[PDB]
Amino acid sequence: GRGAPLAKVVFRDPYKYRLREEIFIANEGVHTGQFIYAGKKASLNVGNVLPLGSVPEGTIVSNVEEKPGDRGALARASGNYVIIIGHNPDENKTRVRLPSGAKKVISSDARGVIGVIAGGGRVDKPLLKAGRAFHKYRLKRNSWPKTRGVAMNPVDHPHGGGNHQHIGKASTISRGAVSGQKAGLIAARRTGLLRGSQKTQ
């Protein structure tokens, strides 16, 4: 139920004679037997984990923390990555652009891992038939298949009811709506086929 492969990465224990194993999200091109370096003063190759400080802008980084030491949070899905676009040395920040395109500024002590996440393009292939969707969610959660509220009775949904299948009122619903009201396009600030190019400015 994860799109991207994981990668078991074994380490020594600094304080006791033992191995300690971790579970990383495998960045693309990472291979068994490879050595992974993790730290402030580590070098800049795919697979190592380095604080957002220690990488020049344009570095491409995955599984990056929001807060330093929360052990990874951003860009973890098969194919995603964050780009560093700038640093503030005084008040040690860094500014990044997340997979959604939002620009966010975090501590430079927050760590990421050099590269992108393996399994890119997983979504390019048509699912092609019900059953593959069926098995997809079989390993995720019980969210499939989905019935249109407009096929229900009014008891079941705001869209339910009528002698023809229709929403009956606007399907844009307020942010200040209430549980039981919010089905449709919640808080939508526009609507209709996105004409023209998107992309954040």
Partner: protein, 91 residues
């Protein structure tokens, strides 16, 4: 002994799903089934098994890759951009 004018591996799907949808799948199945050249021993013995997990017949190396091809385009460009930027740390 040419068997199909054009459906290739996609011929398993019969008349179903509509041509354009089968096309797209054919591209990515041809991708995801082929044997690939191994970086570590040069034998063409890398094959896939589960999206993004490419490993080697002999030599037994497993390389995390793209979902249906070993090297995704974008990671490849990323490679050289880590190339590039790292150069600015020794030199």
């Amino acid at each position: 002994a040419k068997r199909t004018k054009k459906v290739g591996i996609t011929g398993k799907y019969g008349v179903r799903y509509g041509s354009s949808l089968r096309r797209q799948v054919k591209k990515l199945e041809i991708q995801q089934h082929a044997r690939y050249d191994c970086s570590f021993c040069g034998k063409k013995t890398v094959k896939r098994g589960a999206a993004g997990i490419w490993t080697c017949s002999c030599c037994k190396k497993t390389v995390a890759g793209g979902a249906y091809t070993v090297s995704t385009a974008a990671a490849a460009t990323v490679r050289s951009t880590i190339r590039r930027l790292r150069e600015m740390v020794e030199a």
